[PDB]
Amino acid sequence: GKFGFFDDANKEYVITVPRTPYPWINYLGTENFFSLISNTAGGYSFYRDARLRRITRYRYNNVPIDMGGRYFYIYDNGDFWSPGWSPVKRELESYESRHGLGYTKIAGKRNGIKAEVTFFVPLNYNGEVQKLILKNEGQDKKKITLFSFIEFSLWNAYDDMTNFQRNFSTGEVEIEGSVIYHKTEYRERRNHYAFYSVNAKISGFDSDRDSFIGLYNGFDAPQAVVNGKSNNSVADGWAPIASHSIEIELNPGEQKEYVFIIGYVENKDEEKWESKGVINKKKAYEMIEQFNTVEKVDKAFEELKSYWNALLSKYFLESHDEKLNRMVNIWNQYQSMVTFNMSRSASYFESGIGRGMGFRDSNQDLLGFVHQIPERARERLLDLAATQLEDGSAYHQYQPLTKKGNNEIGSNFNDDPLWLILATAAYIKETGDYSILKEQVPFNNDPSKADTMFEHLTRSFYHVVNNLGPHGLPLIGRADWNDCLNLNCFSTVPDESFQTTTSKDGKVAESVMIAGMFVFIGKDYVKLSEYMGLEEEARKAQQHIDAMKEAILKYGYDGEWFLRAYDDFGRKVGSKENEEGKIFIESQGFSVMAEIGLEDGKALKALDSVKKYLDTPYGLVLQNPAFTRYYIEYGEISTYPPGYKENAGIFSHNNAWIISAETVVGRGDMAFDYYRKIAPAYIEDVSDIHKLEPYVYAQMVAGKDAKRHGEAKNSWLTGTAAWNFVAISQWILGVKPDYDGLKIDPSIPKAWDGYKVTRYFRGSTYEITVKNPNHVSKGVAKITVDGNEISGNILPVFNDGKTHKVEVIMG
Amino acid sequence: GKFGFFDDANKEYVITVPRTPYPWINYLGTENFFSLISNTAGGYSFYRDARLRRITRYRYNNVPIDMGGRYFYIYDNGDFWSPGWSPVKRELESYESRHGLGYTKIAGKRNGIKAEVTFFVPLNYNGEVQKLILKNEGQDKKKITLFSFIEFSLWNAYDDMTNFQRNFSTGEVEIEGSVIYHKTEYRERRNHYAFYSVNAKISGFDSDRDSFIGLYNGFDAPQAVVNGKSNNSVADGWAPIASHSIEIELNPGEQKEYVFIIGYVENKDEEKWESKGVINKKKAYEMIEQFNTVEKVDKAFEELKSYWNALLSKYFLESHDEKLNRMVNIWNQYQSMVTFNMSRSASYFESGIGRGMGFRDSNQDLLGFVHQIPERARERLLDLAATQLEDGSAYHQYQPLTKKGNNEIGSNFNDDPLWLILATAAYIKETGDYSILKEQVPFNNDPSKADTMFEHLTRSFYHVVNNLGPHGLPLIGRADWNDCLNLNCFSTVPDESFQTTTSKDGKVAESVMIAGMFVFIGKDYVKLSEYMGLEEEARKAQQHIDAMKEAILKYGYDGEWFLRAYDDFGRKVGSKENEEGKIFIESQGFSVMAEIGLEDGKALKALDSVKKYLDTPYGLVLQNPAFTRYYIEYGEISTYPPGYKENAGIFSHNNAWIISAETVVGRGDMAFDYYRKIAPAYIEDVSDIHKLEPYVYAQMVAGKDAKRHGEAKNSWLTGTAAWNFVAISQWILGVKPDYDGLKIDPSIPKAWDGYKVTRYFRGSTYEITVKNPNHVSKGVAKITVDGNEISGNILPVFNDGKTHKVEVIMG
Known part of the structure; x- marks a missing residue:
């Protein structure tokens, strides 16, 4: 259709x-x-x-x-x-x-x-x-x-x-x-x-x-x-x-x-x-x-x-796939820019009466639009950091119109601070502008409490360190990235918010997803600490990262996949011992991306389990099996009918993380298949089933437990565009910003013969032609820059306003 | 039409x-x-x-x-x-x-x-x-x-x-x-x-x-x-x-x-x-x-x-006017009962998203429905008193569902407490049940702070006494009965409430309308104090009433009509020296009803001025001339286009007060003409102009300054029905409940030959036939009960469940 x-x-x-x-x-x-x-x-x-x-x-x-x-x-x-x-x-x-x-x-x-x-x-x-x-x-x-x-x-x-x-x-x-x-x-x-x-x-x-x-x-x-x-x-x-x-x-x-x-x-x-x-x-x-x-x-x-x-010219792709070309060159970047301009205010599913967007959403969109508007990204990062509280926590809702946090909604979403570190690292990798770390930034919009940006990052990093649970895993608080996983609510009364009402003290329930995010982002935090000349601080941060990794390996792995959480009773969430919700998707992508279990086969087992239990022709569902009744100890997630929204629906936002994780283990065919199952240009042939715009991403697609399996909701306004663009352009195609410059590390389907990417980076233009004569999925055999062989996979920084030809040969 | x-x-x-x-x-x-x-x-x-x-x-x-x-x-x-x-x-x-x-x-x-x-x-x-x-x-x-x-x-x-x-x-x-x-x-x-x-x-x-x-x-x-x-x-x-x-x-x-x-x-x-x-x-x-x-x-x-x-059978009228009969016997009482059942929740102009009605609104509705449901009226009075604060003030919004006041909206509408005294007096006059005064009633819904109902009335009475201004007149606060007269707001920024935002300390602006209400209700308060055996308290209350009367006569009269208020600058509101709003309607009805100026001709002058300046074929406008621009010192009233809502619109709610005042001076023809100009059954012939329901009252009718003069807004949900029924049935027709029983004091057009009213009162039925052989407007020459001539104008209380024939001869 x-x-x-x-x-x-x-x-x-x-x-x-x-x-x-x-x-x-x-x-x-x-x-x-x-x-x-x-x-x-x-x-x-x-x-x-x-x-x-x-x-x-x-x-x-x-x-x-x-x-x-x-x-x-x-x-x-x-x-x-x-x-x-x-x-x-x-x-x-x-x-x-x-x-x-x-x-x-x-x-x-x-x-x-x-x-x-x-x-x-x-x-x-x-x-x-x-x-x-x-x-x-x-x-x-x-x-x-x-x-x-x-x-x-x-x-x-x-x-x-x-x-x-x-x-x-x-x-x-x-x-x-x-x-x-x-x-x-x-x-x-x-x-x-x-x-x-x-x-x-x-x-x-x-x-x-x-x-x-x-x-x-x-x-x-x-x-x-x-x-x-x-x-x-x-x-x-x-x-x-x-x-x-x-x-x-x-x-x-x-x-x-x-x-x-x-x-x-x-x-x-x-x-x-x-x-x-x-x-x-x-x-x-x-x-x-x-x-x-x-x-x-x-x-x-x-x-x-x-x-x-001009906005779309900094990343251009030439490949054999015209659908991939139209997604990468036009529509993904257009959606990212529109999302930056519009936040989460008005759509045909958002009534326009909201007061702002999510703090984590504002940080995640930057990963998508940083390569197009670096200066506005820097300004937005400083504005977001100015709203952070003195203990390192963040207001859940950010209001771009007034550049202030929402006091009524509050705080205690314990994953929010790490997104600031991730966004700052992405900005620095894109631009190389370390001076943003030395900017004086107020705390809680108070000029008298101002400190450096790196101090904001340090407090964000140590908010997780100072809020661990009995197993050594971060306390989930009101909610992690999944806003419907409320392990401290225990609500019996209608019209009571699942996100701002808590009946428990929040000292037992832990999150494995926050642990994986902490391990993934602590690498960038340690690198930034090393840049600032604080070697002892970097060593302590590395020690905390190692402790979190050991905690994940000891209490976060269920045997064939990573656990999701612990509830207020201390019971496992996302375990084979559970009757429903035996496996979640959020705890696998960030755990594999953090390179946990890469050598013992735990990451491969988790990805195989994700394929076995969560895979549908329209994407990957959030958890399996779906909840068939209300669970008072889980919050809003079980209040949906099966296959809809967070109750085993398909969120391509967290499908992008699985795509990146598949690239990490070197399986480019699986990563591209997952990308194709959700990319708009590849589903335009089933528009009648999708029912929504065939040129932009939607937030949710009905899962396999739903009667409307394949139908989309909440289009045009989501953080999916940014993460999916990052996954396709950096993890699969292998053009990744890094502190020392442009890194080439493709993870592609092995049947591809090659492609070309023209990238505007740090004041220069790189015309990178990737060739795959031996038909591998991952691994770079040779890199030549301007006719001269180089060492490693990091491209030199020229900043001369010219074009440089790069030849990459896989093997 | x-x-x-x-x-x-x-x-x-x-x-x-x-x-x-x-x-x-x-x-x-x-x-x-x-x-x-x-x-x-x-x-x-x-x-x-x-x-x-x-x-x-x-x-x-x-x-x-x-x-x-x-x-x-x-x-x-x-x-x-x-x-x-x-x-x-x-x-x-x-x-x-x-x-x-x-x-x-x-x-x-x-x-x-x-x-x-x-x-x-x-x-x-x-x-x-x-x-x-x-x-x-x-x-x-x-x-x-x-x-x-x-x-x-x-x-x-x-x-x-x-x-x-x-x-x-x-x-x-x-x-x-x-x-x-x-x-x-x-x-x-x-x-x-x-x-x-x-x-x-x-x-x-x-x-x-x-x-x-x-x-x-x-x-x-x-x-x-x-x-x-x-x-x-x-x-x-x-x-x-x-x-x-x-x-x-x-x-x-x-x-x-x-x-x-x-x-x-x-x-x-x-x-x-x-x-x-x-x-x-x-x-x-x-x-x-x-x-x-x-x-x-x-x-x-x-x-x-x-x-x-059964709900409508307690007041039955037999007269020569079929429109009057249909208004009094069916539709006014039906609207009063519907208003009691529905509060101000849902209409075709109220979207149904509100959280309650006005405290004064409930108190005024009680006056309308007390003769139909006395027990529910008693329960509602006790519930309303339970929300009163310890200093004698009341929450502006009452929520009948939870029987609690609205804390977000707040207090400091300095006319609210007196309506409780008025409603309690009306209930006692209707039923004769003084025992409601001895009920233990909580303060601010706190059982530990409970006192008697009479203590609640005393605190309501002395809230006005303890909040006088420089001229000895009550401080208006946020607003009086007119919610759009905000003399302490001085608002410049849009989207901020005129009623809950104050930039002034509220120690200068006074209200003459609250002074008139205080003098009018202090009579009932003194009577209730005398009943409870507190002679010294009654004498002190009478002294305060006399002081307020002198203050009104000295600083509340403009020369030909009563002044409206004083602003925060101490300037007169509703004065002939003002360029616009030279005279208001709210300060005349309550002043004349309080019997101020009856002997020196001041009340007659004020009523003549009201006729001269405020009278239109569709009713009486709020003030004249209309405000043609925004007045920062007056609040919301000047934010309307001329002739609409409180900017010189027609509110029959305050037209009823002018009707009662006209009855007070003995001019029944003027009172009935004013009643006819706004009664629905008398305007059904101009429905196309009225545009709203021809069988119930509307809140507002566009005034003479509007291009839609005669068009109604906000029908079916207003306190107009109660006050208009009171004015027609007690002040014009002359069947008034009183502490000792039923009082007969008609004020009717001179051309009427007579009428009949069947009234269910205190367990008995009175069949009162009024005759006007000499064609007077006011004054009773003879009253005969069961064939025996009585003394005075108060009917004896039988409480025997029988019918007693009463003959009234005017003269």
Whole structure:
């Protein structure tokens, strides 16, 4: 089942039918103004905050789905339709949608009239620009009417959808020329407003929803569009909208162009009013003048294309697999950048009312986008470290808008501090900029408590050391990376949070996953300690790492796989002795990546067990068997039906760790098979089963215990893109940043003959051609740089702005 | 503009067209199970808590409006329609709706097939019963299919509408026989579930929304109904629904009857499962068996009718005005009882996410419903007093479910304590039960700090005494009765509450309206103090009352009307020297009711000024002139556009106080004109302007400064019903409870010849016939009880369960 195809030359996904299994969306905007747009032009826009600065209204889980957005109505002699096929849903002669990099194109034809709309947010612009082209492809002269419609939001989304008893009397608009300004609460405390404008003379307008649509009518047939005439209504409370109407006369073969702008303006309090009750429109006038011709719009479109091309140019792959090429070169990096820009705020599954993203998620995304925006990565790392508490713990939720931690949610997720060390090590390996270690960083956003970045890393490292359990393993606390494994909750009451409610003291339950992560990250911590000249501190850290490794080998191995945890009773979690959940996935990847059990066959046994018990054609499930009842001692994980979410669902986020672990043991075929089972481009042929966007990763896919096995949920906003890109580009393809430079260590399927990677690293360009004449999976026989043989597998650092040819021969 | 009529014999409002200016709703349920149902069968149900126990999903501010509810689809040979005309919106041969007392009837006919559905909640039943009658009124044999449909909610409205990450993977149902059980999260921590059942064999079912309706289809054309066949889908996450389908063959003149039940079941934790994964259904079986025949449904319907008739029988009026009779005998008392049952939880303007009602709101509602349910009023008074703090202050928000105050919202609304004294005095005057004063009542819900009820009243009285301002007037605090008059806020940043954020110490701003309330209620406080044998305390209280009266006369009168307040700068609010807001309405009614200025003409001057400046054909506005800009020193009141809400809107709640004040000065014509301008039955002829329900009061009507002058907002849930009933039944008609018994003191229009009131008072029935041979407005010339002339205007108390004839001659 296919609903479109990939256009690699244009870097687009082309949707050919409007009835996709689910509405497939795209993101517009780079810095402050952001838009979500579906393939039928549904969605909404906001300014830096989907919770507090929502511009347009969107209804989630609506009947019918995805109703509301930038709606264009073509009215022709009684008939009317929409180029996106929605909301009118009248059959079109042709329909097409294209999701590109920061822009969306929607084309529709009916009765010989074709409408093409391009939506995008220009760089350094607080608005969404929509270029509309109307073409008469018939043989007769035509007289039509064009309607443009958006529905405004009342800024505060929660108040917009709950507080009608006040906000039904606050909606205010202004209409001037071809611009409709939304200025609700501008009269009292808001210095900002929105506007909807078109660059042509209009025949009519509408600003009241009830007048344009009708109380008992839907979006599919507004009364004004049915009548073919605007009502010129002025909104007074209730629901403000913005609708233009233009009467257009088209000769056969003639076309017309229009530019619509959804803009946001912030005024200063001293220049708020042109006169009494009249808002100041100078900034809006400048914004409208900026894009009043098609040529300016095209120039901005080319600038956005160049910006996005520059963002993706630092890692380029040339191989025999076009699906792999399109994943690595375009869509994975695009998703990583979009995730950085959007955090976890708004999607079609995130309602946009959240207050921030996870601290560990913010640290993990950096691993994915560090090679594209190193300076912003450095700034984000410093901002994340500034929120750390004095004891080394971290706030669970980070708020990028205010750069502060969430005090209500709290702390005591005992895996959070190590992600900061991992992200800092990744940044240093990418850039070589050790100076970030000497930066003075406040603790808990307090300048008086400021210390170095390395002090933050040291406190993060020793938070685990000072919080060990009876077996010598780290105390899990409220939760580890798995937020649904709550071993201290013991909840019996509904509406009680599994993550912030604890009934146990948290002094017994341990985590093997945190132990593996500690061993994996302590290597980087010891290296950074050695760089700073602290040899004794490095020795003590190594001693603690060795102790944790011995603890894992003694109490963390079940016999054929690594144990998952210990509960508050001291009982094993993830053991063959358990009735359900005999094996988990989280404790195998980090244990093998930490090189535990490599010489005695324990890692190989664990990976074989993972293959035997967790493998499905759609990926690897979280644990097996699934929990068939509620377990009070485990928390939220057992509250799901089997095969869904953390109850034996498929998270490709932790599939990436298994991929890396398979590369560690030298099995590149298994690693690539696991990568292929979850990569979007390889599953586009089963889109109807996947049901979600075939060009980006989703958070969860229903597992083998579910009836909807293979169906995805929570797409477009997850840390999966970063980890999967790291696994494919560094662990399988073997181009790994390292403290001394670029390391080459591929772990590939042995049937491959070779490939090429062009990598921008530390101010230079490396063109690395990997060849596999003897058809091995791992091991480098020879490396030649600029025609000269080198020693080892670390490429020299040039920093000269040139291109250097590297030849790698496996063997 | 009329959209229906009144049926006084059946105590109903009959809506004859489905397209009312707004959806008009009714409430079902008395104790625990509650339902909101519109005239097209839209709405939803819940169990005691619209926030935490919502059973069915409803979307507010939807396009089209009022989509979702108990939807019945009649499918006939390809055609399909709905008896409520919604959501199909196909033209019907006939449509009718009837809103009664606790029940709603909807009848619709198409193609010779008639469907009549009665919705009601039986007494002592945790479910909504819908009786459906299908009649073939054509001349041909017919074969049709009947579809039922409801959409389930996931028990938590906020989580249901914001948390999709989770909730899209939790929906679970069971299907057994003709019953569909909704059991989301029953497997982990919920001991309750819902069900939808029909008392006949079904031909098919549907429980998944995407299978019954389709992803891109709306409620107006579900795909299963379009195909005329059920899909037998089993819900697995996403959106659970419930739908039966029955194939029915009807001969000409033949009719069939069905009973549908939306039920709620709570199981014990020890008895939750019939077997592994199978819920226990014994309670559901008993509930379904209770109403499996039409005869049982009819018996329960008659029982509900008898219950509602008994509730309304304690005050009966016989006059020449049928509109007045219908307002007083049926609809005002019905609204008072519904307001008591529902608090301020759920309406079509209240989203149902609130956590309680106002403390003063409950105290004021008690004045309205005390004569119908004295014992429940006593219990509510004790519960309200139990939340009072030790210093005499009260929590602003009361939560009737937990009987606790809202700590987050807080206190410092300095008018709240006096309402408790007023409500207690009203209860004692109604019942004569002084024993409530001797009850031991906790302070702040602490049994260790318990004292008498009279101690609570004393602390409430002395909270005002100990919080006076520089002029001797009470300090307003956060706000008085007007919650939008915030004189200590001075807010500049948006999204921060005007009511809970204060930038001022609150030691300057005073309130004249609180002073008037204090003088008005101190009379009852002094009477209660005299009853308890505390003469010195009564004398001290009288001294404080006299001091407040002198303070009002010296600093509270502007020259022709009473001042409103003083701000933090010490400047007059509601003064002729102000540019806007020269006069307010709140400070006149309570000042005149407190009998201030009766002898020097100040009260008459104030009432004449109110008539001159605040009077509109749709009622009296709050203040004049309206505020045309934001005033940082006044708070939220100036944040509204002119003529809306507290910015010069019409609140009939405070119109009732002006009505009572007009009765005080002996002008019954003005009082009745003011009452008529706002009474629903008198405005039913301008329904299109009113736009809201013509049978219940609304909170706000747009004032003369608004373009929508005469349009209502926030209907069905307000304290207006209680105060307006008190004003009409006690102040105008003159039947007033008092400490020694029933007092007769009418204040009526001079043209009236007389009337009759049958009043149930203190265990007896009084049949009072008032005659006005000399055509006066106020003053009683003679009172005769059982043929014997009495002295004074207080009727003797019999308490013998008999009827006594009273003749009142005015003069």
